[PDB]
Structure formats: structure tokens, C-alpha cells
From TrEMBL, chain A:
GO terms for molecular function: ATP binding; protein serine/threonine kinase activity; transmembrane receptor protein tyrosine kinase activity. ATP binds at K40. Keywords: ATP-binding, Glycoprotein, Kinase, Membrane, Nucleotide-binding, Serine/threonine-protein kinase, Signal, Transferase, Transmembrane, Transmembrane helix. Belongs to the protein kinase superfamily. InterPro entries: ANXUR1/2-like (IPR045272), Kinase-like_dom_sf (IPR011009), Prot_kinase_dom (IPR000719), Protein_kinase_ATP_BS (IPR017441), Ser-Thr/Tyr_kinase_cat_dom (IPR001245), Ser/Thr_kinase_AS (IPR008271). The modification Phosphoserine is found at S169. This is Protein kinase. Its main location: membrane. One of its GO terms (cellular component) is plasma membrane. It comes from Solanum pimpinellifolium (Currant tomato). Residues 12-284 form the Protein kinase domain.
From TrEMBL, chain B:
The gene is avrP. It comes from Pseudomonas syringae. This is Avirulence protein.
Amino acid sequence: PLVDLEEATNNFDHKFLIGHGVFGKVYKGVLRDGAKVALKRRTPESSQGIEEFETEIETLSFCRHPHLVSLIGFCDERNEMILIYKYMENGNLKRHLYGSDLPTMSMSWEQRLEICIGAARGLHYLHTRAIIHRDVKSINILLDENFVPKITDFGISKKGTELDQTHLSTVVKGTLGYIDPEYFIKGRLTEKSDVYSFGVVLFEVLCARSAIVQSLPREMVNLAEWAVESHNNGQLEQIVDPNLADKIRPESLRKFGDTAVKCLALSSEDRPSMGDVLWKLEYALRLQESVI
Amino acid sequence: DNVTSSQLLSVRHQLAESAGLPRDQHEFVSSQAPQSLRNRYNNLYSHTQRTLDMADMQHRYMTGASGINPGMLPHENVDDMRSAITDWSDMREALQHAMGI
């Protein structure tokens, strides 16, 4: 923080709208200056929501990136604790991938890749700043009026000391489908733990199996496991995605799947850095053009 | 909406206590399994396990006992297991019916 006080204070009475979370709710609102805004009211269930509220303040004081949700202000007044961001018109990536409703059909392959690249750029920057997100997922990737991806939610994120090389050790945190198994079985956390998590998002984008962990089908319950079962050895499956038709150039499909497979390596040792993940994605977007 | 962990755990135990067709019905599922369609039991059983586990996971996360967010909201678990209770009381009806033949 170069400038210190960005402490906005008590708006109106609550207009029931938009998303809901486990620790607190989120509402849309318009401010005195006409700015459409997003209020993460964290008063429902104060089960150490305090800690995550403060974490999302200091982590987000490095508020200077096009692919990181910009914090406008905070509260902590008369028992309340609300965080404030610009309103993302198009919501989250999950919403656009076999969630529910709103027509004009599905996203394009280019658009999908443009999003994945943008999300990578954000995560890579976090790693430049020794910040490990820990809670990377399709729900946590917001996109604006122009579908520019923005990484949201940092209540679980961790800062390191050595800057880049940090292989730290703490309690296990995250979402069921996205937890780095090495982080789960051992308790060791690394920046590469975000890479596995992002690796799931990649396949989530591809297959539109935006359900990821799905407690209905066969031995294909874990998306980060059923997809690896293919674009690794079993098939290189062109059969895993919804109706992306004959729109993906086979060479880019191999590249995208290969990268997403490499992200999901069991040991963090073998996973690519978000930096390389980024280059690979840009190259897979690139791999959609030239003659013989 | 707005569902509590105490409320949740209450619905969890409610399902667990009701996931149990009576003796004389089960006596004739491993002896006079009515057709093949009545795997509806063993499919529901495993599903109820899945429901109860996810519910138990959900609870620990809300309580602060664990930092693994299970992936769905607390009201989604109650809606899943309140549903699962009907599935059992239908099995118990379906079996009483099919076996009384």
C-alpha cells in the first residue's frame, strides 16, 4: 500500500441479488458516484472469517493487475466486515461452461483460450509476488463486460519469503476437486499447488464438465483423473468435450490437453511453472493458423 | 435459506437413522430379490454413503474443523439428504409392495 485509506463506509439497505458463499454473501449495488459495485458482506457465520477478511486486504493491496479482481474498499465498522470490488458483468467462468441459463449458445474455442491465458497471466504474477492462491477454480475466475478474466477471492492465499522458490508447510486448504494431492497427502505447499488447481480449470474449460467432482457416473468421478486417463495414454480423447464440434484444430487440442495433463502430474516436481503454462497456452492459441 | 451447521448435522443424523429398511424386508432382498430393477437398494445405499460423507465434510468446513471446502453450499447438502430420506421411505414402500406377491 502506497496510499493508505480506501475505507468506504455503510451504503444502503440490502438489494437482494447475485452470488452466495459459505462465509458471507455477495450483492450488486450502485454507489453515490454511479459506479456499479460488488459487496462481499462477510457477516453471515463469523467462523474465523475475520482471518480471511484481513488476508484479502493485505494480499489485495498489491492491487495492480488486469487479471486480478481490483479491491475498491473495505468496512470493519459496527461489527460488519465488507469488501468492495468493481462489478463483473459476465460473472464467473463456470457460469459460461455448462452451468445454467442465458442463450446465444456456448463460448468459442478462441474465447475459451483467451480466458485461460488471462487467468494464467494473473496466477503467474501472484507467483512473481510469492503469493500462492490455494483456491484456484472456475468459480473463482471472474470476467468483465469485455470478458477479460480476473482472479478473485484471496482469503486462503499465502505469502512466501524466498520469492518464487517457496516450498512451505501448513494446514490443508482448498476446494475438494482442486486440491493438489501432494499438498493433501503430505502437507507441503508450493506455488505449483496452484498449477494442479489450474490444471483442473483447463480441463473444465475443455470438457465443459464444469461439474468436475461428479458423484453420479462410473470410475470417472474425478475430472482431473478421468481426463488424464485419456490425453495421457488411454485415447488423447476428442470424445471428452460437449459440443465444441469440429472447431478445435487437432494440433492445438493436443497442446492444450498436454499442458493440462502436465499440470496434473502427481508430484509437483514434474508440473510446469505457470510461466511455462502461460507460454504453452499462448502457443496453443497460436497453433490455429498456418499452411503446410 | 441461510442454513446452520447445527441444522445441517441435525439433517445428517436424520438421514443416517432412516437409512435402514426393517428386518423382514432385508431378509427378502438377499433371499427373494424381487427382480433385477431392485438394485435400487444397493445403488441408493452407496449413494447415501456419498451423501453422508459430503455432509460430514461440509460440517467440518463450516465448524472450522477443516479447511477443505467440499464444493457445494450447506443448503445443497440438506436438499440432497432430505431428498435421500424420501428415497428410503420409497424403498421401504417398494419392497413391502413387491414382496407382498
